[PDB]
């Protein structure tokens, strides 16, 4: 019997890595209609894999809410569960690459079944040793009903996927129907641990922020032969062609760091996060993962000014979605502010307006940038760059801006 915080932290790290694995094929896509189709397919695959892995992570988190403590065998079983979960993105990609081949569907169903079987073994071991359960379960009137219930919840997905694996040899669309039902039913027919959500979001933000520096380190280190031959021995000339990559990395890191700053400030005032906030956070992270692609597109070559307008608009849309989902989380938590928010950030509270401005800095900025792309298109990219300069400073002097707005309201 031992504490289980570090094991779940490791689980969150692994699950964030597995959720964000599928953004690498997107950011590595080369910048004609075939390229656009490939990019759309890769974006769709990334979104679906992120949603699936986040569903698996949510199931894991609400599984280990029941299993209070951990043990050596529980740690090994959790490691096995993590290994089985790590195959979700690759196997789903193989599935969607060959939709009419039953082998891909069979492999996806087998992966989901393996995850469910390991989780069922974990639950069975936990209930066989009651000291590992949470005190509420350890004391529950009918503890074994909770088992009959947790086994059903855990094994519902494996059963539907097993039936889908059956139907893949006879009727593939039916396999698709039950496979989508696996993810649909738990939400279409409860609080989520705030520590797990915080750790998953921190992992996702850390991974997304440092994608471009990883890529630059892997590829964009100048080669001495090319330095002495293409750039005539001038290392600064060699690094000049790499400059757009550095600018894209700086922009992506600044944006993702500021979004994480807003998220961190939001969650420092959350007492307990409902699953609606969990869904909104999942959507926010899914759209945050697309920021490096937007920055790569904007920093890329501009064949025509219309291409620059389109890329600036796309980047603004991605930023707007990624931040508006955080704003939606904040409003949803405000709806139940009695039990979800600290007294400081309640309606009319001390920090209410400050937090509102902190979470609305980015959506409004993206909205005005997108509006300028249609009204002041001649300066579009310029104002976009101005935004990249304005937003961090607005974060630096947010309290001063809020005080100025309060004074303006006071004199009005």
Ligand X SMILES: CC(C)CCC[C@@H](C)[C@H]1CC[C@H]2[C@@H]3CC=C4C[C@@H](O)CC[C@]4(C)[C@H]3CC[C@]12C
Ligand Y SMILES: CCCC[C@@]1(C2CCCCC2)Cc2cc(OCCCc3nnn[nH]3)c(F)c(F)c2C1=O
User: In this complex, which beta carbon is closest to a copy of itself, that of residue 131 or of residue 399?
Assistant: 399
User: In this complex, which beta carbon is closest to ligand Y, that of residue 42 or of residue 245?
Assistant: 245
The least distance separating ligand X from the CB of residue 146, rounded to whole angstroms, comes to 15
Report which secondary-structure segment, H or E, holds 91: helix 88-97
Piece of 75-83, 110-118, 204-212, 220-228 that binds K ion (CB under 5 A): 204-212
Piece of 91-99, 115-123, 251-259, 260-268 that binds ligand YN9 (CB under 6 A): 115-123
Q: Which does 124 bind (CB under 5 to 8 A by kind): a copy of itself, ligand YN9, ligand Y, none?
A: ligand YN9
Q: Residue of minimal CB distance from ligand YN9?
A: 124
CA dist., res. 401 & res. 405, Å (int)? 6
Should residue 265 be labelled a site residue for a copy of itself when binding is judged by CB under 8 A?
yes
Q: Which does 247 bind (CB under 5 to 8 A by kind): ligand YN9, a copy of itself, ligand Y, none?
A: ligand Y
Piece of 60-68, 142-150, 281-289, 394-402 that binds a copy of itself (CB under 8 A): 394-402
Should residue 203 be labelled a site residue for ligand X when binding is judged by CB under 6 A?
no
Piece of 111-119, 131-139, 174-182, 204-212 that binds a copy of itself (CB under 8 A): 204-212
Should residue 159 be labelled a site residue for ligand X when binding is judged by CB under 6 A?
yes
Q: Transcribe 15-80 into DSSP letters.
A: HHHHHHGGGHHHHTS---HHHHHHHHHHHHHHHHHHHHHHHHHHHHHHHHHHS-SB-HHHHHHHHH
User: In this complex, which beta carbon is closest to ligand X, that of residue 157 or of residue 203?
Assistant: 157
x/- mask, ligand X, residues 314-343, rule CB under 6 A, reads: ------------------------------
Should residue 121 be labelled a site residue for ligand YN9 when binding is judged by CB under 6 A?
yes
CA dist., res. 160 & res. 84, Å (int)? 18
What crossing angle do the helices spanning 398-411 and 380-396 adopt, rounded to 10°?
90
Q: Transcribe 186-220 into DSSP letters.
A: HHH--EE-HHHHHHHHHHHHHHHHTHHHHHHHHH-
Count the residues of the shown chain that bind a copy of itself, applying the rule CB under 8 A.
71
Q: Which residues of 297-315 are buried (b: 16+ CB within 10 A; e: fewer)?
A: bbbbeeeeeeebbebbbbb
> Long-range contacts for 296-301 (Cβ within 8 Å, ≥24 apart)?
296/27, 296/31, 296/212, 296/248, 297/31, 298/248, 298/251, 298/381, 298/384, 299/244, 299/245, 299/247, 299/248, 299/251, 300/31, 300/244, 301/31
User: In this complex, which beta carbon is closest to ligand YN9, that of residue 122 or of residue 361?
Assistant: 122
Should residue 110 be labelled a site residue for ligand Y when binding is judged by CB under 6 A?
no
Among 55, 155, 398, 402, binds ligand YN9 (CB under 6 A): 155
The least distance separating ligand YN9 from the CB of residue 257, rounded to whole angstroms, comes to 20
Q: Where are the beta strands (DSSP E) in 362-407?
A: none
Contact 93, 160 (CB under 8 A): no
User: In this complex, which beta carbon is closest to ligand X, that of residue 148 or of residue 306?
Assistant: 148
Should residue 393 be labelled a site residue for ligand Y when binding is judged by CB under 6 A?
yes
Q: Which does 393 bind (CB under 5 to 8 A by kind): K ion, ligand X, ligand Y, none?
A: ligand Y
Piece of 84-92, 152-160, 273-281, 297-305 that binds ligand X (CB under 6 A): 152-160
Of residues 256-285, which lie at the interface with ligand Y (CB under 6 A)? 257-258
Q: Which residues of 42-54 are buried (b: 16+ CB within 10 A; e: fewer)?
A: bbebbbbbbebbb
Paired with 270 in beta bridges are 341
Length of the chain: 412
Strand 191-192 and strand 273-274: the pairing is antiparallel
> What is the distance of C-alpha 210 from the center of its chain?
14
List residues near ligand X by CB under 6 A.
Answer: 113, 155, 158-159, 162
List residues near ligand Y by CB under 6 A.
Answer: 76, 79-80, 83, 247, 250-251, 254, 257-258, 385, 388-389, 392-393, 396
């Amino acid at each position: 019997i031992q504490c289980s915080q570090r094991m779940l932290s490791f689980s969150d790290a692994l699950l964030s890595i597995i959720a964000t694995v599928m953004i690498l094929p997107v950011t590595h896509t080369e910048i004609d209609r075939s390229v656009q189709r490939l990019l759309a397919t890769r974006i769709a695959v990334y979104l679906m894999t992120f949603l699936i892995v986040t569903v698996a992570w949510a199931a894991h988190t609400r599984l280990f809410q029941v299993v209070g403590k951990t043990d050596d065998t529980l740690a090994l079983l959790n490691l096995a569960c993590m290994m089985t979960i790590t195959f979700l993105p690759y196997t789903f990609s193989l599935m969607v690459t060959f939709p009419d081949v039953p082998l891909g569907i069979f492999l996806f169903c087998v992966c989901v079944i393996a995850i469910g079987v390991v989780q069922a073994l974990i639950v069975g071991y936990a209930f066989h040793f009651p000291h590992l359960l949470s005190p509420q379960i350890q004391r529950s009137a009918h503890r074994a009903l909770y088992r009959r219930h947790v086994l059903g919840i855990v094994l519902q997905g494996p059963a539907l996927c097993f039936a889908a694996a059956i139907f893949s040899l006879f009727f593939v669309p039916l396999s698709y129907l039950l496979m989508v039902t696996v993810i649909l039913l738990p939400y279409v027919s409860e609080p989520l641990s705030k520590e797990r959500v915080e750790a998953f979001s921190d992992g996702v933000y850390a991974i997304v922020a440092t994608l471009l520096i990883l890529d630059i380190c892997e590829d964009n280190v100048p080669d001495p032969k090319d330095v002495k031959e293409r750039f005539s021995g001038s290392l600064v000339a060699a690094l000049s062609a790499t400059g757009p990559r550095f600018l894209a990395y700086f922009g992506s890191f600044a944006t993702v760091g500021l979004l994480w700053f807003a998220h961190h400030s939001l969650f420092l005032h959350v007492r307990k996060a409902t699953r609606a906030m969990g869904l909104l956070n999942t959507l926010s992270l899914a759209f945050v993962g697309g920021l490096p692609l937007a920055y790569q597109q904007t920093s890329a070559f501009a064949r025509q000014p219309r291409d620059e307008l389109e890329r600036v608009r796309v980047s603004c849309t991605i930023i707007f979605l990624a931040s508006i989902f955080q704003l939606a989380m904040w409003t949803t938590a405000l709806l139940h502010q009695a039990e979800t928010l600290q007294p400081s950030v309640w309606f009319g509270g001390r920090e209410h307006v400050l937090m509102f401005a902190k979470l609305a800095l980015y959506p409004c900025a993206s909205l005005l940038a997108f509006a300028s792309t249609c009204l002041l298109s001649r300066f579009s990219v310029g104002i976009f760059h101005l935004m990249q300069i304005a937003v961090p400073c607005a974060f630096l002097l947010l309290r001063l801006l809020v005080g100025l707005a309060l004074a303006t309201l006071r004199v009005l």
